[PDB]
From Swiss-Prot, chain A:
The keyword Ubl conjugation applies. Gene3D superfamilies: 2.30.30.30. It comes from Saccharomyces cerevisiae (strain ATCC 204508 / S288c) (Baker's yeast). PROSITE patterns: RIBOSOMAL_L6E (PS01170). GO terms for molecular function: RNA binding; structural constituent of ribosome. Present with 37100 molecules/cell in log phase SD medium. It is found in: Cytoplasm. Disulfide bonds: none annotated. N-terminally acetylated by acetyltransferase NatA. This is Large ribosomal subunit protein eL6A. GO terms for biological process: cytoplasmic translation; ribosomal large subunit assembly. Component of the large ribosomal subunit (LSU). Mature yeast ribosomes consist of a small (40S) and a large (60S) subunit. The 40S small subunit contains 1 molecule of ribosomal RNA (18S rRNA) and 33 different proteins (encoded by 57 genes). The large 60S subunit contains 3 rRNA molecules (25S, 5.8S and 5S rRNA) and 46 different proteins (encoded by 81 genes). Component of the ribosome, a large ribonucleoprotein complex responsible for the synthesis of proteins in the cell. The small ribosomal subunit (SSU) binds messenger RNAs (mRNAs) and translates the encoded message by selecting cognate aminoacyl-transfer RNA (tRNA) molecules. The large subunit (LSU) contains the ribosomal catalytic site termed the peptidyl transferase center (PTC), which catalyzes the formation of peptide bonds, thereby polymerizing the amino acids delivered by tRNAs into a polypeptide chain.
From Swiss-Prot, chain D:
The modification N6,N6,N6-trimethyllysine is found at K36. Belongs to the eukaryotic ribosomal protein eL18 family. Signal peptide: none annotated. Keywords: Cytoplasm, Isopeptide bond, Methylation, Ribonucleoprotein, Ribosomal protein, Ubl conjugation. The chain holds residues 15 to 146 of 186 of the full protein. This is Large ribosomal subunit protein eL18A. It comes from Saccharomyces cerevisiae (strain ATCC 204508 / S288c). Component of the large ribosomal subunit (LSU). Mature yeast ribosomes consist of a small (40S) and a large (60S) subunit. The 40S small subunit contains 1 molecule of ribosomal RNA (18S rRNA) and 33 different proteins (encoded by 57 genes). The large 60S subunit contains 3 rRNA molecules (25S, 5.8S and 5S rRNA) and 46 different proteins (encoded by 81 genes). eL18 interacts with NAP1.
Swiss-Prot record, chain E:
Component of the large ribosomal subunit (LSU). Mature yeast ribosomes consist of a small (40S) and a large (60S) subunit. The 40S small subunit contains 1 molecule of ribosomal RNA (18S rRNA) and 33 different proteins (encoded by 57 genes). The large 60S subunit contains 3 rRNA molecules (25S, 5.8S and 5S rRNA) and 46 different proteins (encoded by 81 genes). This is Large ribosomal subunit protein uL30A. Present with 101000 molecules/cell in log phase SD medium. The gene is RPL7A. It is found in: Cytoplasm. Component of the ribosome, a large ribonucleoprotein complex responsible for the synthesis of proteins in the cell. The small ribosomal subunit (SSU) binds messenger RNAs (mRNAs) and translates the encoded message by selecting cognate aminoacyl-transfer RNA (tRNA) molecules. The large subunit (LSU) contains the ribosomal catalytic site termed the peptidyl transferase center (PTC), which catalyzes the formation of peptide bonds, thereby polymerizing the amino acids delivered by tRNAs into a polypeptide chain. The lineage of its organism: Eukaryota, Fungi, Dikarya, Ascomycota, Saccharomycotina. The chain holds residues 50 to 244 of 244 of the full protein. One of its GO terms (biological process) is ribosomal large subunit biogenesis. Belongs to the universal ribosomal protein uL30 family.
From Swiss-Prot, chain F:
It is found in: Cytoplasm; Nucleus. The gene is RPL4A. Disulfide bonds: none annotated. Signal peptide: none annotated. N-terminally acetylated by acetyltransferase NatA. This is Large ribosomal subunit protein uL4A. The eukaryote-specific C-terminal extension harbors a nuclear import signal and delivers the ACL4-uL4/RPL4 complex to the pre-ribosome, triggering uL4 release from ACL4 and incorporation into the 60S ribosomal subunit. Belongs to the universal ribosomal protein uL4 family. The chain holds residues 312 to 347 of 362 of the full protein. Component of the large ribosomal subunit (LSU). Mature yeast ribosomes consist of a small (40S) and a large (60S) subunit. The 40S small subunit contains 1 molecule of ribosomal RNA (18S rRNA) and 33 different proteins (encoded by 57 genes). The large 60S subunit contains 3 rRNA molecules (25S, 5.8S and 5S rRNA) and 46 different proteins (encoded by 81 genes). uL4 is associated with the polypeptide exit tunnel. uL4 interacts with its chaperone ACL4 and the nuclear import receptor KAP104. It comes from Saccharomyces cerevisiae (strain ATCC 204508 / S288c). There are 2 genes for uL4 in yeast. Changing K4A: Significantly diminished nuclear localization. Changing F23A: Leads to an inefficient release from ACL4 with a delayed assembly into the 60S subunit.
Length: 143, 78, 130, 132, 195, 36, 177
RNA sequence: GGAAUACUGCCAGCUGGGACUGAGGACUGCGACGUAAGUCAAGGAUGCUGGCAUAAUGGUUAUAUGCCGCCCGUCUUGAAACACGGACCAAGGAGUCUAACGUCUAUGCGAGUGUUUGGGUGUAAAACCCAUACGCGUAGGUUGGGGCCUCGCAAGAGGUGCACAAUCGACCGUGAGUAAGAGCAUAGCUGUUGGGAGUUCCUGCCGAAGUAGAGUUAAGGUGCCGGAAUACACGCUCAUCAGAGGCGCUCAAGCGUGUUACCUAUACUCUACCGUCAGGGUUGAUAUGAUGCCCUGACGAGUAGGCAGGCGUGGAGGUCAGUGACGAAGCCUAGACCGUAAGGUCGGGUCGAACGGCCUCUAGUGCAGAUCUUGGUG
């Protein structure tokens, strides 16, 4: 109170806007392969592990397969393909949002590779990048 | 074609891009009427003021902390 | 007669009034706290009134009451606000006890601004002395 | 009709301000009626003579009522006996004022009536004949 | 109570039709006692005789519309303004949607929106109507206070139909192949597109 | 200040009509008339 | 919000002359910032006594450079005053970077010779930190040129130009162009 | 016999993708759910993440290169063009004061009202005051009835009754009636009659016979200029009169007849904004002129006609203890700011001695064209 209020302070009206947990798109499910459309790893195929509280999807390359480390990715900048891997092998509880502010990636990668081996040619798929060739129309293209 | 529908909003009317309404000032006494309304108003020295008076007005305005719209006019050009 | 005086001053020549480009009016009256010609503003319009006004280094408080409406020479009682800002606000509130909130709020704001102006004119005119 | 008196008289405007405030803040329709009357032009404010006041009081049960005339009251020498009452009106001619004072009555402005009867209790409004 | 009444009334009409057919005797429905009218034509190039009628029906602009009680007196008024308006029998669903979305109440001639039951109560409790749905019942039926409830509602302001007007040319009568005229139940198709 | 359409916002819909809540649970709109 | 008291300024000056610390410098500079921004604009400090304000201005302009030099003593190299390499210098450098535009506002608000001389001297003892910046070194040389350009006192102009020579001839690299 | 599907209709049935809007600024209300406490999508957007500057960029100016246009007026579409006309420069350039009656408004007085017909007085036409006359004025019954009183929480029960009306009558002298008058004077605006007697500063408003975003849509249109299918389906027609803004078109880009889709307006819906109107709130005083502030709603085309509000130009009174060689007034200013605009403020230039702002009353806004005339030039 060391200064009397010069002019006046207009208090903001109370806001009836409570934040609620996000409702993700139906295609996104744990163990779903993803295509990243921007950033350092744009056009690179990655695996989906879990959805964080702050609405940043968590993804692993695996770094072993394609050199993409554990990372947070925005959901809207990602395409979801119809091919899946079982994520039950990897537990994915410890690492969280605040944690993001090598050994863990190795632990995750061993379990995820274990499931990757069963499906044919999946490692090659995750290794290679994606791009649009001439004559490719996305709207028909089933991803 | 001019017409009333083009009229500007009252809350934004008569406002410079700096956000200060321009008020004409002739002498120090008229400057002092804008002592606290520094946020709402900015002073503008009249065209007919002599150079000797303009420096005094500018000094008093700086002391009061009132924005002058046209300083360095007739003390500098443009 | 304050209402009559105000109505004449409003719909006739308030010589201290200046019509700004926006349409807002400013009374030039030195005693005026709020330099805007209104019902609550013209010291001429209102019998009960107060203002902070600077004389030399001091920031005096001027009081106006209907009792001294006659004898305008002695009308404005002069009170010295203490240099301590907190003490000054306390003295203003005390003297303006049971006094309409408009004049009290405006008086406090004017005291704050005049104190800042005194500080900053001390700033602009700092000299080698002391 | 009007929303404010066309006259530029300061005192009429003050009375209009008081009565519009009362009509806004009083349930009684009396304040509304007098407020609407205050706006009227001279032709629509015919003079109500002391004669009409005498008739209005002769009506049964109205002897002690405060007669109200939004306008001017004029004397009438036709009468010799005039009862005592506290007429209220905007203006009073010298003859009418003398007649009211002489008979023990008294004349008040409409502000004094508002102080007396903010809800217009026991009031009797009168209006002059606007034949032409 | 109103919901049960509506369901029972509809089932009763259907059952009466089925029973009459089974007996071999025709069934005739009671003539509809309510119509909804909508303005189709601009004010210009209108004679005085239809112009005065349009004022009575509370229609002052194109695409506005209102409910009208069906009587021998009122039917001839519609006949007078046949070129410039399109009208038909409104179903319950259309009236409900109109009242909920575009409903506006006349409170001291100030077109107050009907956003709360209290607003309707303060005006129409004198007539025993305390909610939006009570008003909807008074409208869908011809109640003892239909005039007052209908007059309380501000004339509806409707957008042009989303799908379109149907026929390429509007200004012919409904059978001739144009928008204006008595189209009866099909008004429900139009109004829902407009609302 | 703003008009909230009952059809799109359930809260105001319930405010205008309480019986709408019960009717939604009952689903009388999709009720089955007896086959008879 | 702390209120400036004639006690608090006295204590800050008391511990300035003996064993100052970066916390004290940031506190002093923030108070200085409020002092210079009173007419032209959250702030931790409030100013109410003219004695406290004048004492703050005095001690700041006349001794905060002294403490700054003592913490991070520059060394004369090829005629130029250059700071050394070290962490402590960098911390002090951000502190002078938090004092510079208060000096700029004072420069833009010069009205007489002695105030010009004091501001220019305090600015003089803070070149070696502000040569590392170009929003400040430019506006510095732009402001004092502004003073050298707009003053009507020949002594003020002489002081401004003498400052320009003394600072320019020392360094010649960042400023002279 | 068993049904299914199609169509129509309803759902206060779910769930997905788009686009525009984020208006409001302590709380109050209707609500919803919560055992409860509290919470919320319930009377207008908040939260999370990232970056946040010698930048992002923005302005001015100059060459060279090529494309198009290219005497002037009018005309023209939407626009150059095109269709129609053109000795040359400078000017000047189509009538006046005043009266009679009447409506409305404001002020003063009031059965009155007006003075000035004269005189006194006078820092002297004045201002202040007296008479002196005449002018124009004066010479009930009942029902309803705004209002006020009682009872009533309220609806009502009544009681009483302004103006005025309704009929009912008395008297005076069958109405202008009386039975309880209003006029006079001044000023403003203004209707008519008159005495010689082309357009019209800007904005708004009322009315015979609006700005911006989103969506929808009429009239129309979907070869390109140009935004939309060179889409479909029929019947035709290419005629030496084929047939329709420009270019162009001929199994049409020509017709008539139907189908959808699509483009979009001063039209309709929602929002925000600006104006006019209307209804409101607000004083043992407002955090800014109760002619203020605030809330809510409706409308904005409008021809004939009518009304208001602003801008600018002079005259006078008052005022800003206004402005001025450290530069007043006047003029210009493809500069900055403001206002929807008429314009205003400032900067600069020019100018070189005085003038402006503001309250009041009083005068008073820019163009067109003809007869031609004169000088001057062919
Ligand atoms: Mg100028
Ligand atoms: Mg008269
Ligand atoms: Mg009687
Ligand atoms: Mg469409
Ligand atoms: Mg819809
Ligand atoms: Mg609204
Ligand atoms: Mg949707
Ligand atoms: Mg009578
Ligand atoms: Mg009677
Ligand atoms: Mg629009
Ligand atoms: Mg559109
Ligand atoms: Mg307020
Ligand atoms: Mg209207
Ligand atoms: Mg109109
Ligand atoms: Mg003058
Ligand atoms: Mg000019
Ligand atoms: Mg503009
Ligand atoms: Zn004033």
């Amino acid at each position: 109170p060391k200064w009397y209020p010069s002019e006046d302070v207009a208090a903001l009206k109370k806001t009836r806007k409570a934040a609620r947990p996000q409702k993700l798109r139906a295609s996104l499910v744990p163990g779903t392969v993803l295509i990243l459309l921007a950033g350092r790893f744009r056009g690179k195929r990655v695996v989906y592990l879990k959805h964080l509280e702050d609405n940043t999807l968590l993804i692993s390359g695996p770094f072993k397969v394609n050199g993409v480390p554990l990372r947070r990715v925005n959901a809207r900048y990602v395409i979801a393909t119809s091919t899946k891997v079982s994520v039950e092998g990897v537990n994915v509880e410890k690492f969280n949002v605040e944690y993001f502010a090598v050994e863990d990636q190795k632990v995750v990668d061993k379990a995820l590779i274990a499931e990757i081996k069963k499906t044919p040619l999946l490692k090659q798929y995750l290794s290679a990048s994606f791009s649009l060739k001439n004559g490719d129309k996305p709207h028909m293209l089933k991803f | 074609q001019p017409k009333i529908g083009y009229g500007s909003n009252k809350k934004t009317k008569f406002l410079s891009p700096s956000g200060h309404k321009t008020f004409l000032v002739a002498n120090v006494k008229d400057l002092e009427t804008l002592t606290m309304h520094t946020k709402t108003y900015a002073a503008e020295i009249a065209h007919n003021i002599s150079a000797k008076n303009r420096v005094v007005i500018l000094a008093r305005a700086k002391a009061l902390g009132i924005k002058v719209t046209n300083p360095k006019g007739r003390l500098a050009l443009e | 007669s304050d209402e009559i005086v105000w109505q004449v001053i409003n719909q006739s020549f308030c010589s201290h009034r200046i019509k700004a480009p926006n349409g807002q009016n400013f009374c030039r009256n030195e005693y005026n706290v709020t330099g805007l010609c209104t019902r609550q503003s013209c010291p001429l319009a209102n019998s009960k009134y107060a203002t902070v006004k600077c004389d030399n280094g001091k920031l005096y408080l001027y009081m106006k009451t209907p009792e001294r409406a006659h004898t305008p020479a002695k009308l404005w009682e002069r009170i010295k606000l203490s240099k301590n800002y907190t003490k000054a606000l306390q003295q203003i509130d005390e003297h303006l006890l049971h006094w309409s909130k408009f004049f009290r709020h405006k008086c406090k704001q004017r005291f704050t601004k005049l104190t800042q102006v005194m500080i900053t004119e001390r700033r602009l005119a700092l000299r080698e002395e002391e | 009709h009007r929303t404010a008196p066309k006259s530029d008289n300061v005192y009429l405007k003050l009375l209009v301000k008081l009565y519009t405030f009362l009509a806004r803040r009083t349930d009684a329709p009396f304040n509304k009626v007098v407020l609407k009357a205050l706006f009227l032009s001279k032709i629509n404010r015919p003079p109500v003579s002391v004669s009409r006041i005498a008739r209005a009081l002769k009506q049964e049960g109205a002897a002690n009522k405060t007669v109200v005339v939004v306008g001017t009251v004029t004397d009438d020498a036709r009468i010799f006996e005039f009862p005592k009452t506290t007429v209220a009106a905007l203006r009073f001619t010298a003859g009418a004022r003398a007649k009211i004072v002489k008979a023990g009555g008294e004349c008040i402005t409409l502000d004094q009536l508002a102080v007396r009867a903010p809800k217009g209790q026991n009031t009797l409004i009168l209006r002059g004949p606007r034949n032409s | 109570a109103y919901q049960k009444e509506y369901e029972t009334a509809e089932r009763n009409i259907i059952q009466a039709k089925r029973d009459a057919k089974a007996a071999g005797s025709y069934y005739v429905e009671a003539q509809h006692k309510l119509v909804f009218v909508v303005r189709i034509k601009g004010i210009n190039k209108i004679p005085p005789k239809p112009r005065k009628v349009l004022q009575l029906l509370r229609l002052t602009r194109i695409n506005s519309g209102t409910f009208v009680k069906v009587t021998k007196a009122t039917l001839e008024l519609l006949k007078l303004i046949e070129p410039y308006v399109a009208y038909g029998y409104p179903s319950y669903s259309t009236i409900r949607q109109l009242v909920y979305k575009r409903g506006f109440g006349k409170i001291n001639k100030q077109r107050v929106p009907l956003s709360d039951n209290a607003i309707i109560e303060a005006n129409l409790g004198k007539y025993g109507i305390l909610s939006i749905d009570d008003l909807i019942h008074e409208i869908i039926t011809v109640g003892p206070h239909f005039k007052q409830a209908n007059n309380f509602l501000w004339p509806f302001k409707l957008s042009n139909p989303s799908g379109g007007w149907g026929v390429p040319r509007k200004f012919k009568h409904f059978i001739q192949g144009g928008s204006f005229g008595n189209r009866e139940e099909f008004i429900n198709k139009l109004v829902k597109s407009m609302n | 200040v703003l008009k909230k359409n009952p059809l799109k916002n359930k809260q105001v819909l319930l405010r205008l009509n309480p019986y709408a809540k019960v009717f939604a649970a009952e689903k009388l709109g999709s009720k089955k008339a007896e086959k008879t | 919000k702390i209120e400036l008291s004639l006690k608090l300024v006295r204590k800050w000056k008391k511990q300035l002359h003996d064993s100052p610390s970066l916390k004290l410098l940031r506190n002093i500079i923030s108070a200085f910032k409020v002092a210079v921004n009173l007419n032209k604009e959250d702030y931790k400090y409030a100013i109410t006594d003219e004695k406290a304000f004048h004492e703050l201005m005095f001690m700041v302009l006349k001794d905060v450079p002294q403490a700054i030099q003592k913490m991070a003593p520059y060394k004369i190299v090829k005629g130029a005053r250059t700071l050394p390499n070290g962490g402590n210098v960098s911390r002090v450098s951000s502190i002078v970077k938090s004092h510079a535009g208060s000096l700029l506002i004072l420069l833009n608000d010069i009205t007489n010779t002695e105030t010009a001389a004091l501001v220019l001297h305090s600015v003089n003892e803070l070149m070696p930190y502000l040569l590392s910046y170009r929003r400040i070194l430019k506006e510095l040389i732009k402001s004092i040129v502004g003073v050298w350009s707009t003053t009507r006192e020949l002594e003020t102009q002489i002081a401004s130009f003498a400052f320009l020579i003394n600072t320019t001839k020392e360094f010649k690299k960042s400023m002279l162009e």
